[PDB]
Design a protein around this nucleic acid. Structure first.
Ligand code: MG
Ligand code: MG
Ligand code: MG
Ligand code: MG
Ligand code: MG
Ligand code: MG
Ligand code: MG
Ligand code: MG
Ligand code: MG
Ligand code: MG
Ligand code: MG
Ligand code: MG
Ligand code: MG
Ligand code: MG
Ligand code: MG
Ligand code: MG
Ligand code: MG
Ligand code: MG
Ligand code: MG
Ligand code: MG
Lengths: 208, 68, 294, 169, 157
RNA sequence: ACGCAGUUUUAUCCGGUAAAGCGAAUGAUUAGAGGUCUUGGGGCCGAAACGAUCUCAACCUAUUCUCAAACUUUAAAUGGGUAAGAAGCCCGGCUCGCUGGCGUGGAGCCGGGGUGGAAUGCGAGUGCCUAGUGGGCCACUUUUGGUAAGCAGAACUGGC
RNA sequence: CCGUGGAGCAGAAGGGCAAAAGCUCGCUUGAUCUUGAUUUUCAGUACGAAUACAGACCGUGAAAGCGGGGCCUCACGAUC
RNA sequence: GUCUACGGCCAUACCACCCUGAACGCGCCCGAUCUCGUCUGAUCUCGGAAGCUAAGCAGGGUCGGGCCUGGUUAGUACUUGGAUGGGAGACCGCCUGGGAAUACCGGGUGCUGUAGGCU
């Protein structure tokens, strides 16, 4: 296991798992929701999300260790089914290794210069959200402390932001309680459906 | 003994040392490369222009000199 | 619950063509029929479009431009009562007759009347129109049978034979006229003249008058209810071809105007559409207010 | 009160799928010739089974399409064999129904012992005047919504004509 | 070492873009390609018989020879040495006109009409195409409403 | 006046990178919801029974998370080609064995008419003979392999 | 019945193709002879490949036209 | 105000459903003796015209799906040229110029040439 001191900020084109690679091992992370997966929208009002600052690459093993630390702090703080954490970031960039000493100068040189797939990292833009935790109104500081414990573990500099939106949807929490009741937004599981006015009349007849 | 393989560095400057030239001068364009049926038209048309153009063009020149 | 029928199919649907979705063109034969070779730059390629429809057939000669197809001349089957042939408007005789009318009308429009008589006496041979030196040459035209399958006996070839006997130089073969035997390669001209004059359907009228008069009164009703007898048909088409070749001038109709119309239902405006929507909203609110209580 | 929108027999399919080629398939074609008076047409590959021994391009089946009064007569003989008792799932969603018979000499044909005991698939489609649009070469247009034949229309046709029983079980 | 064969970089360039796959239109054929006509080159994917080369795509040439169902165009191609006038045989489907020469002929016709009017009425016309002039000392209007004060907004994430 | 430009302007085409998207095709990929066709595994009414019920598996519909140098609806900046006239525009007439309803079309030839036809800068075109050269390197920017290199290899420009 | 290419086009991929360049059927060798021009690599040399022509003899088609090998991108060779 | 035949633009003109069609025309329809090719006159051809606008077709409609166009996104992501600008790097800011797209919202849905016929 080579350190993250050598696999670093983006210097090559994205090389994903596809028909052309066919040699990547399995990634470290497999799941992405840890809290109440079947949580309704009105259950957990607010959310805090972890904003990046450096154009870096985050590894899947770092994502594993960070989601384990955040899950452990959430189940110590607010217990089971009192939070919902989602890792927004998904690993697709496959790094390459050029290993040697398979201890003398007599194995190869720089003859075969193309490498073998070692692991999977994820390219992170500036301002891209790493993780997002939705909880109650009184659990404002616990989300901050959990994302701080993830901040001590991710490399580089990144900040925290408690969102103006209502959880994972793209709609504002200030207009949410006013606008889900009258006309438009209907709860669909953990997501929210937005109806336009460009529908057939049978949808409006089935509603109201 | 590995050497440098291929480059186009320091090439546009050598191109513009002497001022890359348009052909820039073709009056009465060349005629080779054109349809042989069209050439069987045009050569017979030119030699009968050389033969039978005298009297009608002469009377037309006299008529336009009289009318202008 | 089963199929994933239409999600982005409408968004990635490439429409074929207006006339192809109507089912009137193919364009794989039109790209070769229409387009003139570029050594001429202006010379129109004259095409005799022969379209067979129910109750009428159409025979035209047209060419093409980039704006649209310019029609040089046209002829229809429904004017044959005005040109002599009262009944039988979609037969092989009407095809030959419409081709002869179209050829005589085109040569009358071009003024090539006295020369290029063509074939006056209908014989059914392979009469090919030749060009006369010192005179304007023959009219070079090419066929358009359209989407119809060109089997031997199709009356698009009868319209072709009418155009050729009228004097339109169209290159053609004799192995698709009716009367050409499939096994024996020899062509029969007497059968083709018989099929121009329409004596086989005269034999079928004799067959109906001998076998079963019930079908003879069921079909062929306009024939027997004005007048049709086979000797008068054999004289009637022979008089009709001469009556067309003596007067192809196509006297038209005046058609000034009749300023009376209410047929097409016009569109409705944006405000009218939105107020239909608003009345539907108000009526459903009235339904939810009234019928849920009552 | 219905202008010329009448359900009628469009065609009638006759199919015999023999598990081998040669003698039995040729005698099945001879049976279809004894029914119709017209020659059948054979079938072929796009599958090789290997479980009972048929191969590519072998004459697996014979079939024949009958139209008109002969189709109505063979339909009458088939419903006389079944004694007018179909089931609910015979009628397709497009308004077409098949039933099939065993013991093909029940139609009224003198059996020869050299031929063999076969059976024959009967499949009926329904038609209205105006179904030549989708089959003609020039303007292949759509059928329509109010004109197409449905499940309920087909089963009410079979209730009205021939006095059949549905047997919805 | 890039295997310099015919059309080794034409995954997109000789492709019909979107909602245009099918038969070719006939107005592409029904054009007037006479001699001396300044034309353009744009390769087609449907007709694989007369596409010029990947190097002549998007270029502009002059017609020297016209045949039955193609055309011959002279094109200035740049190579390592110097630009050269080269003789190409391209079919009709790959070629459209160039409207720049048509716009120049329209300008020449308008200048000839203005020169005829000048010779008629004795009026100088200034028919040269002057470029975009500097703005004259024009006059603004601020009646009714005061000029709206703009200030930069605070930073909110 | 003739003409030219590592340049700009006015018109006219060309592309498929940066970006963006995949509730749009192809390839991947996360999670929840609704519906009930199908088969498989449990529990219930009880001889058994698609006679009936609950859950799960797969399927469909509307969503939702994250991407793709060898994906793309869209699509920049930069850039490439062309035209900016006396070699051009119009009129009249001959020739053609090319073409052909046509003195139709197209080419060539002959005679005549009017030059003030975007900016800026510069005096241009052409022929012969020939040395040296064919080991390169560095830097801003765009990038390939490598963990990285004063590493190896490319593009423009500048320098040694 | 739905079915815009999700199949097929000899084979590695890319482009392209629906009364089609895909499948089936009927005739046929234009996969023939000959002289120039052009593109590709390029030094504007050659080879291989290809294009538009021209002149004969032809094949198919009702004619239009199409065809001098494979729908295109390679599948091949100087002096003596 | 329309249709028929041939079209040019190639979804503003396709797909699903519901209404309307008076006059020509377009068609569904009625039958195989000749021309015709099929297992079947289902398809293609032969002489029709007893009914019909049920269907195609032509118009209108769907707070319709798609398509085109216009705001929003957005002077944002990008990008030519510059600095002895910042930062350890990652990258970021500025001067000079050019300037994109999805969600979101709003509007439309055929225009025409030739030839011919009906009000
Ligand atoms: Mg070297
Ligand atoms: Mg054809
Ligand atoms: Mg590229
Ligand atoms: Mg990108
Ligand atoms: Mg020397
Ligand atoms: Mg040396
Ligand atoms: Mg180096
Ligand atoms: Mg070195
Ligand atoms: Mg120096
Ligand atoms: Mg279909
Ligand atoms: Mg392929
Ligand atoms: Mg030849
Ligand atoms: Mg028969
Ligand atoms: Mg026969
Ligand atoms: Mg019939
Ligand atoms: Mg109706
Ligand atoms: Mg109808
Ligand atoms: Mg409509
Ligand atoms: Mg819509
Ligand atoms: Mg910059």
């Amino acid at each position: 296991r080579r350190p993250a001191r050598c696999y670093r900020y983006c210097k090559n084109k994205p090389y994903p798992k596809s028909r052309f690679c066919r040699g990547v091992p399995d990634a470290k992370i497999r799941i992405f929701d840890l809290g109440r997966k079947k949580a309704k929208v009105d259950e957990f009002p607010l959310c805090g999300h972890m904003v990046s600052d450096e154009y870096e690459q985050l590894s899947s093993e770092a994502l594993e260790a960070a989601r384990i630390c955040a899950n452990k702090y959430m189940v110590k703080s607010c217990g089971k089914d009192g939070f919902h954490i989602r890792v927004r970031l998904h690993p697709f960039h496959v790094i390459r290794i050029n290993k040697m000493l398979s201890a003398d100068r007599l194995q190869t040189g720089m003859r075969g210069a193309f490498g073998k797939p070692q692991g999977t990292v994820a390219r992170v833009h500036i301002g891209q959200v790493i993780m997002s935790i939705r909880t109650k109104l009184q659990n404002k500081e616990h989300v901050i402390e959990a994302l701080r414990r993830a901040k001590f573990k991710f490399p580089g500099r990144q900040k925290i932001h408690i969102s103006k939106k209502w959880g994972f949807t793209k709609f504002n929490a200030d207009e949410f309680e006013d606008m889900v009741a009258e006309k438009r937004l209907i709860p669909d599981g953990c997501g929210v459906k937005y109806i336009p006015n460009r529908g057939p009349l049978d949808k409006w007849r089935a509603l109201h | 003994a590995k050497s440098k393989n291929h480059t186009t560095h320091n090439q546009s400057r050598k191109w513009h040392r002497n001022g890359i030239k348009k052909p820039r001068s073709q009056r009465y364009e060349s005629l080779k490369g054109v349809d042989p049926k069209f050439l069987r038209n045009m050569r017979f048309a030119k030699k009968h222009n050389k033969k039978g153009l005298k009297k009608m063009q002469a009377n037309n020149a006299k008529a336009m000199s009289a009318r202008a | 619950v089963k199929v994933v029928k239409n999600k982005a199919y409408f968004k990635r649907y490439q429409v074929k063509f207006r006339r192809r979705r109507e089912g009137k063109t193919d364009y794989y034969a039109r790209k070769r029929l229409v387009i003139q070779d570029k050594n001429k730059y202006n010379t129109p390629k004259y095409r005799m479009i022969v379209r067979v429809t129910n109750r009428d057939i159409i025979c035209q000669i047209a060419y093409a431009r980039i704006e649209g197809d310019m029609i040089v001349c046209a002829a229809y089957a429904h004017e044959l009562p005005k040109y002599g042939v009262k009944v039988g408007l979609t037969n092989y005789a009407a095809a030959y007759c419409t081709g002869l009318l179209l050829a005589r009308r085109l040569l009358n429009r071009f003024g090539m009347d006295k020369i290029y008589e063509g074939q006056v006496e209908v014989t059914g041979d392979e009469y090919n129109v030749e060009s006369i030196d010192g005179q304007p040459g023959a009219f070079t035209c090419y066929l358009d049978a359209g989407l119809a399958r060109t089997t031997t006996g199709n009356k698009v070839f009868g319209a072709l034979k009418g155009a050729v006997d009228g004097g339109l130089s169209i290159p053609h073969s004799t192995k698709r006229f009716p009367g050409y035997d499939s096994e024996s390669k020899e062509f029969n001209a007497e059968v083709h003249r018989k099929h121009i004059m329409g004596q086989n359907v005269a034999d079928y009228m004799r067959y109906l008058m001998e076998e079963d008069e019930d079908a003879y009164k069921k079909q062929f009703s306009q024939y027997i209810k004005n007048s049709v007898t086979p000797d008068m048909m054999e004289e009637m088409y022979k008089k009709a071809h001469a009556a067309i070749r003596e007067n192809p001038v196509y006297e038209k109709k005046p058609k000034k105007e009749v300023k009376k119309k209410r047929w097409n239902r016009p569109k409705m405006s944006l405000a009218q559409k939105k107020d239909r929507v608003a009345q539907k909203k108000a009526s459903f609110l009235r339904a939810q207010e009234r019928a849920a209580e009552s | 009160e219905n202008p010329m929108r009448e359900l009628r027999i469009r065609k009638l399919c006759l199919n015999i799928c023999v598990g081998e080629s040669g003698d039995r398939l040729t005698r099945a074609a001879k049976v279809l010739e004894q029914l119709t008076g017209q020659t059948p047409v054979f079938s072929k590959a796009r599958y090789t089974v290997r479980s009972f021994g048929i191969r590519r391009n072998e004459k697996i089946a014979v079939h024949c399409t009958v139209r008109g009064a002969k189709a109505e007569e063979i339909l009458e003989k088939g419903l006389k064999v079944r004694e007018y008792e179909l089931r609910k799932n015979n009628f397709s969603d497009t308004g077409n129904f098949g039933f099939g018979i065993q013991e093909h000499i029940d139609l009224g044909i003198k059996y020869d012992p050299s031929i063999g005991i076969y059976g024959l698939d009967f499949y009926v489609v329904l038609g209205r005047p105006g179904f030549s649009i989708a089959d003609k070469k020039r303007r292949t247009g759509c059928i329509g919504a109010k004109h197409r034949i449905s499940k309920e229309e087909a089963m009410r046709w079979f209730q009205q004509k021939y006095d059949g029983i549905i047997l919805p079980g | 070492t890039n295997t310099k064969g015919k059309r080794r970089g034409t995954r997109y360039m000789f492709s019909r873009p979107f909602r245009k796959h099918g038969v070719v239109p006939l107005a592409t054929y029904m054009r007037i390609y006479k001699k001396g006509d300044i034309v353009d080159i744009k390769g087609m994917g449907t007709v694989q018989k007369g596409m010029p080369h990947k190097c002549y795509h998007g270029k502009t040439g002059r017609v020297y020879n016209v045949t039955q169902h193609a055309v011959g165009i002279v094109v200035n191609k740049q190579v390592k040495g110097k630009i050269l006038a080269k003789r190409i045989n391209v079919r009709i489907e790959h070629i459209k006109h160039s409207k720049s020469r048509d716009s120049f002929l329209k300008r020449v016709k308008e200048n000839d009409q203005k020169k005829k009017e000048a010779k008629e009425k004795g009026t100088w016309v200034q028919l040269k195409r002057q470029p975009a002039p500097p703005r004259e000392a024009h006059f603004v209007r601020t009646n009714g409403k005061e000029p709206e004060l703009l200030e930069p907004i605070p930073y909110e994430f």
